[PDB]
Amino acid sequence: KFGWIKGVLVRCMLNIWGVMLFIRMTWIVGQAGIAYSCIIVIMATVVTTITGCSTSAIATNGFVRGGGAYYLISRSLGPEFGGSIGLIFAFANAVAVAMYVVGFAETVVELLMDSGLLMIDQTNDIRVIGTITVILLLGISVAGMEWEAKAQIFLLVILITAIFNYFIGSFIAVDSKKKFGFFSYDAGILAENFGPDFRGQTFFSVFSIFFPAATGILAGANISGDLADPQMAIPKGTLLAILITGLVYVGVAISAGACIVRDATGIESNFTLISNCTDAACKYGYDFSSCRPTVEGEVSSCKFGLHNDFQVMSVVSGFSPLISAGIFSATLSSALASLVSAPKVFQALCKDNIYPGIAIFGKGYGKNNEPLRGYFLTFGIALAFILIAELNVIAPIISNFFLASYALINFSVFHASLANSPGWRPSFKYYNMWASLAGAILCCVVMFIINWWAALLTNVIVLSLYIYVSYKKPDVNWGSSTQALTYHQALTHSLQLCGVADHIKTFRPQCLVMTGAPNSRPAILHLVHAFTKNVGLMLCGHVRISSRRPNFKELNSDMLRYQRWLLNNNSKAFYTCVVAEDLRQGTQYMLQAAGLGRLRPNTLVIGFKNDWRIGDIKEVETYINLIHDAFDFQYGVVILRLREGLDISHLNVADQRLLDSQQFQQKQGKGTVDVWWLFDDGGLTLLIPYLIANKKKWKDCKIRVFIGGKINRIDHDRRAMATLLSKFRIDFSDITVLGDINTKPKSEGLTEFAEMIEPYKLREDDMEQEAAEKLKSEEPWRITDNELELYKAKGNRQIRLNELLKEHSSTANLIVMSMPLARKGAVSSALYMAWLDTLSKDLPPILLVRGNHQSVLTFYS
């Protein structure tokens, strides 16, 4: 658990200081000037400072523990950005391994050719030595990670003594080091090297070789689970290492340009002052002409100086072979820090199953779950690029991919500050979103100036990887590590949904379904899944009827189990379990306390209870008063009834019930639905069949809108209903008007209905009313104003509508029927249940429905 120095600053300084510090800093002052190379260093420092502020803005957005480089970006921002940043950054480190070990092998090859050892040609010995040192770094990565955390301060004190040896060796004018270039600090060599030469390169061709010397700044953010306090450790160490390394780069460029000439023959001259005919700032007796190129379209056939030999810092240095062999400390550290950092990002990326096929590079073998397949993939990508045994073609690829990664980071923090992402509050003092936009545009434009077709390929790939993660299914076991953003999104969307204008008032029918346990009664789940499918809100209520000692402990586990079952099938429904001693006071909990904000259930849809006369006659009072508790909260009451019941508890008629309970989700809609618009203030009675008719399962549904009308004028009433049907855009005009209602209600069925309520001539479980009978009357069966004195017409109309249902709606899928409402108290519950059961005697799957008559058709605008 390191501090900020040993955990961030030392790692970032060892990662930044790499190949170009000793190998290629003098060549950059050779090609460009001192002024242009300083402009190059300031440009790279601006890019990496803006990216350091964006990384510090990410690192201070909470989310400390269980960190890394992929983790912070993927948790603060979305998966769509973080997956592409992880892939591009992993590939950038994988290709950078090759660059660092190619620089190491080139240094070893030139030190070998300074002796007599030479096996094959020069460009093949780099492949041999680079292959040998990449199979040796992989073994250190997969077998020796323990000593590496102690070795890094030793590598840093080798490297800083190398830098100090070069810087104090420049001040010592040696006459033996003349003819290799390197006179003392002179004004003539300062003025001569002020201004570009560009002997085969250009600006933005020299810059693309420098820019790998500025990368490696995310080596402090690559350990957030090994830091003490990351929100203080990362912005100090990263933004201080950038300053220190950039200042050392500026000092090396200015010091190399002011003491070494651009070309030099390695032959000493006896003169101390040359003959006065050259004036090329070499007044120490060296004539360095006939070493510059003749034409302006070729490289020089010289061998020393700033342009030619690539190793002049070992000449300038006070002690060459051992202190300025900190190149072996600079390259081999950085390559190693890029060999352990690409499979880390790629294994954290393959544990969230964002991209489909790459998920086999996450199985970490061993005790630490080190990704060995990721190490072998990184070894393959590095060894493919090693065989291009030339630094000046590998380095622009590294610059392209790291510039793409840094532009993605800056654009992602800009876009998250712009969009007001819900979990995005970057408490960092020097973060600005417009600076991040400027840095992203700068990296993208420079990436196109360096090479336009490589940049176009990279941007097309990143755009494809963004659009793929945007439009892909949000189901479970897909990227489930990123979960804390979904909570804040679901909270802020509901917080915006609760606040709208007070004069819009869209209807959007919500519904709670008294279904019991959701694995039981599946037909009502499929039928209230038919309508309110990405249209409204569905809700499954379940009242547990345990009276004494309710098992409050196992309610949460059973709720989570039932919700996981309901999510494992196709359903857009939530689940609410309450616990009471009966059904009515149990559903009183969910009538007036369900939902949050505007996601409250509007209508109540229940099933019909067929077993009301078979046994337990008490609970009928719990069932009708429920409806009388549903009509008082201005809800909508929907009753569903099949030919047989829905309560499934598991042979011939049992299989008939089990097959009728799943008659919707698997079958089709061959056969017409038909509504019966009888009440004018129904409302929802027409919204329901239009919603259930526009579905995949329902195509062959001719909505036969029936309406009881005036008997005198049967001509224009159907036109006045047809314009309302055109207003509701249900798009059918098969309207049939009836006039034979309440005429002669089939007295042989009147004798069936009168013998139905014959044991209930005194009302059901009304012990107060029954004991209040005896204080006025002795014969009990004389109160009939409640029962049949004032409501002959209601019962006659109910049985007449039953006969019309049997006649006109013989073959049908559903029947949307307006539900008869009677005022409570004056009408008993048993009489009302008798009317509802005689209205829907042995029909097809009818649907009694009565709305709140507040306002409809505000839906669909």
Ligand X SMILES: CCCCCCCC/C=C\CCCCCCCC(=O)O[C@@H](COC(=O)CCCCCCCCCCCCCCC)COP(=O)([O-])OCC[N+](C)(C)C
Of the candidates 202, 278, 290, 480, which one interacts with its own copies according to CB under 8 A? Answer: 480
Does residue number 216 form part of the binding site for K ion (CB under 5 A)? Answer: yes
φ, ψ of residue 429 to 5 degrees: the values are: -75, -30
Q: Should residue 101 be labelled a site residue for Cl ion when binding is judged by CB under 5 A?
A: no
Mapped onto helix, strand or coil, the DSSP state of residue 74 is helix
Whole-angstrom Cα distance, residue 285 to residue 273?
4
∠ at Cα 814 (742, 526), nearest 5°? 145
**Least distance (Å) between residue 178 CB and K ion:** 33
How big is the CA angle at 515 (ends 511 and 520), to the nearest 5 degrees?
A: 145
Out of 453, 502, 723, 811, point to the residue binding ligand X (CB under 6 A): 453
Please report, as residue ranges, which positions from 419 to 458 form the binding site for Cl ion (by CB under 5 A). Answer: none
Residue 122 identity? Q
Q: Which of residues 180-239 bind Cl ion (CB under 5 A)?
A: 212-213, 215-216, 218
Q: Are 180 and 273 in contact (CB under 8 A)?
A: no
Among residue numbers 65 through 94, which ones bind its own copies (CB under 8 A)? 65-66
Which residue, 457, 537, 532, is CA-closest to 497? 537
- Can you tell me which of 418, 500, 593, 790 binds ligand X, judged by CB under 6 A? 418
DSSP state of 573: E
Closer by beta carbon to K ion, 99 or else 129: 99
The DSSP code sequence of 680-692 is TT--HHHHHHHHH
The one of K ion, Cl ion, ligand X, none whose footprint includes residue 218, by CB under 5 to 8 A per kind, is: Cl ion
Q: Is 183 annotated as a binding residue?
A: no
The least CB distance from residue 455 to its own copies, in Å, is: 9
Q: Which does 474 bind (CB under 5 to 8 A by kind): ligand X, its own copies, K ion, none?
A: its own copies
Q: Which is nearer to ligand X, 415 or 718 (CB)?
A: 415
Q: Which helix (H) or strand (E) segment is 539 a member of?
A: strand 538-544
Task: Check: CB of residue 620 under 8 Å from CB of residue 764.
Answer: yes
Strands 636-640 and 846-850: antiparallel
Determine if residue 84 is labeled as part of a ligand binding site.
Answer: no
Q: Edge-to-edge strands of the sheet including 573-579?
A: 573-579, 538-544, 511-514, 603-607, 636-640, 846-850, 815-818, 674-677, 706-708, 736-738
Q: Is 129 in the site for ligand X (CB under 6 A)?
A: no
Residue entry with tokens 């990436």: 447
Is 335 buried (19+), middle (13-18) or exposed (0-12) by CB count in 10 A? buried
Tell me whether residue 168 is annotated as binding. Answer: no
Q: Which residue is listed with tokens 């793929």?
A: 468
86 CB burial (10 A radius; 0-12, 13-18, 19+): buried
- Contacting K ion within 65-104 (CB under 5 A): none
Q: Does 860 bind its own copies (CB under 8 A)?
A: yes
Q: Is 664 among the annotated ligand-binding positions?
A: no
The listed partner (ligand X, Cl ion, K ion, none) that binds 751, CB under 5 to 8 Å by sort, is none
Positions in 573-592 near ligand X (CB under 6 A): none
Stretch that binds its own copies, among 152-160, 238-246, 568-576, 682-690 (CB under 8 A): 568-576
Closest approach, Cβ 546 to its own copies, in A, equals 13
Site for its own copies in 585-624 (CB under 8 A): 588-590, 592-599
Task: Provide, rounded to whole angstroms, the least separation between the CB of residue 681 and its own copies.
Answer: 16
Q: Residue 284 pairs with which residues in a beta bridge?
A: none
Mask for 384-413, x = binds ligand X (CB under 6 A)? ------------x-------x--xx--x--
**Contact mark string toward Cl ion, 18..57, x via CB under 5 A:** xxx-------------------------------------
Say how far residue 68 (Cα) sits from the centre of its chain. 18
C-alpha–C-alpha distance, residues 376 and 794, integer Å: 83
Q: Considering the complex, what minimum distance in angstroms separates the CB of residue 497 from Cl ion?
A: 35
Minimum gap (Å) between residue 16 Cβ and K ion: 5
Q: Is 357 annotated as a binding residue?
A: no
Q: State the Cα–Cα distance between residues 438 and 136, nearest whole angstrom.
A: 42
* 472 interacts with, out of ligand X, Cl ion, its own copies, none, CB within 5 to 8 A per kind: ligand X
Instruction: Compute the distance between CA of residue 784 and CA of residue 779 in angstroms, rounded to an integer.
Output: 12
Residue 387 in the binding site for its own copies (CB under 8 A): no
Site for ligand X, residues 473 to 492, rule: CB under 6 A = 473
For residue 14, say whether it is annotated as part of any ligand binding site: yes
Is residue 467 a contact residue for its own copies (CB under 8 A)? yes
Residues making up the chain, counted from first to last? 861
Nearest to 294 by CA among 251, 263, 316, 338: 263
**Has 215 been labeled as part of a binding site?**
yes
User: Which tokens belong to 200?
Assistant: 């085969």
Q: For the residues of 168-197, what is the DSSP string, one character each?
A: HHTTS--TTTTTSS--SS-HHHHHHSSS--
Burial class of 599 by CB neighbour count within 10 A (0 to 12, 13 to 18, 19+): middle
Is 330 annotated as ligand-binding?
yes
Under rule CB under 5 A, residue 342 binds Cl ion: no
d(CA 18, CA 159): 10
**Whole-angstrom distance, CA of residue 400 vs CA of residue 455:** 7
Q: Do the annotations mark residue 100 as ligand-binding? A: yes
Q: Rule CB under 5 A: choose which of 4, 9, 18, 55 binds K ion.
A: 18
Q: What is the chain's Cα-based Rg?
A: 42
Q: Measured from the CB atom, is 175 or 554 closer to its own copies?
A: 554
Q: Is 87 in the site for ligand X (CB under 6 A)?
A: yes
| Interaction residues for ligand X, span 185-224 (CB under 6 A) | 202, 204
Q: Is 212 annotated as a binding residue?
A: yes
State both tokens at 333. Answer: 């550290």
Nearest to 332 by CA among 636, 554, 19, 37: 19
Question: Of 228, 456, 654, 826, which one interacts with ligand X (CB under 6 A)?
Answer: 456
Which uninterrupted H or E stretch holds 639?
Answer: strand 636-640
Residue 594 known to bind ligand:
no
Using CB distances below 5 to 8 A depending on partner kind, what does residue 564 bind out of K ion, ligand X, its own copies, none?
Answer: its own copies
Binding site for Cl ion (CB under 5 A): 18-20, 212-213, 215-216, 218
Q: Which residues are annotated as a binding site?
A: 14-20, 89, 100, 212-213, 215-217, 330, 333-334, 402, 406
Binding site for ligand X (CB under 6 A): 87, 91, 202, 204, 356, 396, 404, 407-408, 411, 415, 417-420, 432-434, 437-438, 440-442, 444-445, 449, 451-453, 456-468, 470-473
Q: Which residues are annotated as a binding site for Na(+)?
A: 14, 17, 330, 333-334
Binding site for K ion (CB under 5 A): 16, 18, 215-216
Q: Which residues are annotated as a binding site for chloride?
A: 18-20, 89, 212-213, 216-217, 402, 406
